[PDB]
Curated annotation (Swiss-Prot):
PROSITE patterns: CYTOCHROME_P450. It catalyses: ferruginol + 2 reduced [NADPH--hemoprotein reductase] + 2 O2 = sugiol + 2 oxidized [NADPH--hemoprotein reductase] + 3 H2O + 2 H(+); ferruginol + reduced [NADPH--hemoprotein reductase] + O2 = 11-hydroxyferruginol + oxidized [NADPH--hemoprotein reductase] + H2O + H(+); 11-hydroxyferruginol + 2 reduced [NADPH--hemoprotein reductase] + 2 O2 = 11-hydroxysugiol + 2 oxidized [NADPH--hemoprotein reductase] + 3 H2O + 2 H(+). One of its GO terms (molecular function) is iron ion binding. Expressed in roots. Pathway: Secondary metabolite biosynthesis; terpenoid biosynthesis. This is Sugiol synthase. One of its GO terms (biological process) is terpenoid biosynthetic process.
Length: 467
């Protein structure tokens, strides 16, 4: 009674038929089997959903049913799978971490207060960007967008006041994320073949506990050191960051959260906003460089609003209606997560007549719906003009665009993502002219796909500022 899919082979099921870079294969197989597919990844049953109306059935109509999360083995490291807001069933401790996220830390009231903590972090990059232009060196966009992202998240969370782009604090964080991504970003057969779960054959759960213990040790030091600063100054001026808010929650003791609940929350906030922004800023700074007709419309717009100001204030978003679309088009073409984050059917539920069993990992292919010929016309072409004078937005209600998810577990970092994805892009676009470090380059590198935590270019984007 389940959705249609290819013949499950013994044991392996449909885990050899995927080929390399599965996101496209889960898309092409949908043209024969349908929007609701059934792929037997080993023992892990999985339903692929690749159409807006079906994503509406999954995330909204039956959303409270499909509101779980498939948990990976690396997530059990340091008991993260039982503390994190990302991978907990919708419950008492999760509702608190949402109402805390959306209403206090990610509402506009806190975004506008954290506006000044992040401009300094763009200036450090813009000054470093000018460093590579004088001697005429090339800038690794991924490297530059990662360190800037950590400096951006660390300022929003901790209010670190370093004077160096590659500060000592930031590079301790950079290794651990890249170490975690190198762990989760590769397949762990314990997830698909449960008899291997006790053994942990590839040693994934262990190696994750090492880096998780480090990333949580550095977060602890930033908590206990603030408590003493909170004790020394009783009328301490409210820091306009996320950590100060979190300290002000367990001192009032209104909600029902522990201390480890907050530590692991800052981890998810830190990790969740780093490698996503890092990849999803490499794309626009490639799309605009690969299609110079469109960068020209962005620059001429930016010069119309900036004036002589050389850093983009996140409050000038409404006056950049084209950069809003340029990101929107990058959301459609190259979504950061090709299959988003796995959902789980917490109850036997029927969708479109087919039965979806309990514990069915529902992957919402956002890559296909970005290149589905039935939705966007000429989908394989970059064109931010299709979003001009269009209310289609990635807020979750336009299932034609689901890069940030929708339903009950929508991305809580959306207001912080777009203010980042726009400013750190509009600061490199408005200030310099870019050209590929290698114009005689294989197009396999351009729009290349790397399956892992997020899909990114096959080769890190390396361009030069020559103005
Ligand atoms: C920059 C682009 C980003 C993308 C494309 C992205 C993507 C996603 C997706 C697809 C989901 C799951 C949605 C669903 O299952 O329906 C999610 C959830 C989540 N994201 Fe992001 N994210 C981004 C940035 C961020 C940022 C900046 C933060 C934190 C500051 C963050 C933290 C989280 C957390 C904690 C969750 C768990 C939500 C829950 O389980 O209720 N992400 N994200």
């Amino acid at each position: 009674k389940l959705p249609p899919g290819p013949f499950p082979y013994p044991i392996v099921g449909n885990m050899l038929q995927l080929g390399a870079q599965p996101h496209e294969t889960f898309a092409k197989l949908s043209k024969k089997y349908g929007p609701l597919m059934s792929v037997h990844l080993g023992s892990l049953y999985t339903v692929i959903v690749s159409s807006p109306e079906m994503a509406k059935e999954i995330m909204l109509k039956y959303g409270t049913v499909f509101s779980g999360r498939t948990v990976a083995q690396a997530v059990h490291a340091c008991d993260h799978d039982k503390i994190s807001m990302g991978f907990l069933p919708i419950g008492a401790e999760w509702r608190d971490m949402r109402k805390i996220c959306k209403e206090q830390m990610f509402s506009h009231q806190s975004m506008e207060d954290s506006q000044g903590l992040r401009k300094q972090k763009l200036q450090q990059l813009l000054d470093h960007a000018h460093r590579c232009s004088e001697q005429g060196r090339a800038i690794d966009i991924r490297e530059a967008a990662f360190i800037t992202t950590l400096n951006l998240m660390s300022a929003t969370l901790f209010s670190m006041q370093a004077t160096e782009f590659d500060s000592k604090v930031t590079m301790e964080f950079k290794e651990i994320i890249e170490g975690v991504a190198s762990i989760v970003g590769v397949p762990n057969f314990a997830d698909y073949f449960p008899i291997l779960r006790p053994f942990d054959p590839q040693g994934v759960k262990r190696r994750a506990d090492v880096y998780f213990g480090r990333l949580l040790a550095l977060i602890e030091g930033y908590l206990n050191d603030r408590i003493q600063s909170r004790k020394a100054n009783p009328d301490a001026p409210k820091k306009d960051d996320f950590l100060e808010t979190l300290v002000d929650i367990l001192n009032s003791n209104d909600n029902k959260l522990k201390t480890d609940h907050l530590l692991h929350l800052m981890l998810d906030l830190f990790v969740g906003g780093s490698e996503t922004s890092t990849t999803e800023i490499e794309w626009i700074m490639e799309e605009l460089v690969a299609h110079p007709d469109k960068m020209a419309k962005v620059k001429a717009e930016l010069k119309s609003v900036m004036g002589d100001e050389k850093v983009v204030d996140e409050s000038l978003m409404p006056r950049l209606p084209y950069l809003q679309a340029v990101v929107k088009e990058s959301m459609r073409l190259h979504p950061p997560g090709p299959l988003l984050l796995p959902r789980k059917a917490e109850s036997d539920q029927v969708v479109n007549g087919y039965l979806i069993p309990k514990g069915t990992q529902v992957l919402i292919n956002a890559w296909a719906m970005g290149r589905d010929s039935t939705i966007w016309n000429n989908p394989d072409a970059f064109q931010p003009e299709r979003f001009l004078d269009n209310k289609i937005d990635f807020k979750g209600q336009d299932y034609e665009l689901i890069p940030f998810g929708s339903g009950r577990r929508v991305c809580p970092g959306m207001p912080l993502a777009n203010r980042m994805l726009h400013t750190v892009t509009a600061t490199l676009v408005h200030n310099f002219d870019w050209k590929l470090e290698r114009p005689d380059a294989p197009l396999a590198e351009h729009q290349g796909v790397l399956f892992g935590f997020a899909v990114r270019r096959a080769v890190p984007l390396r361009i030069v500022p020559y103005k």
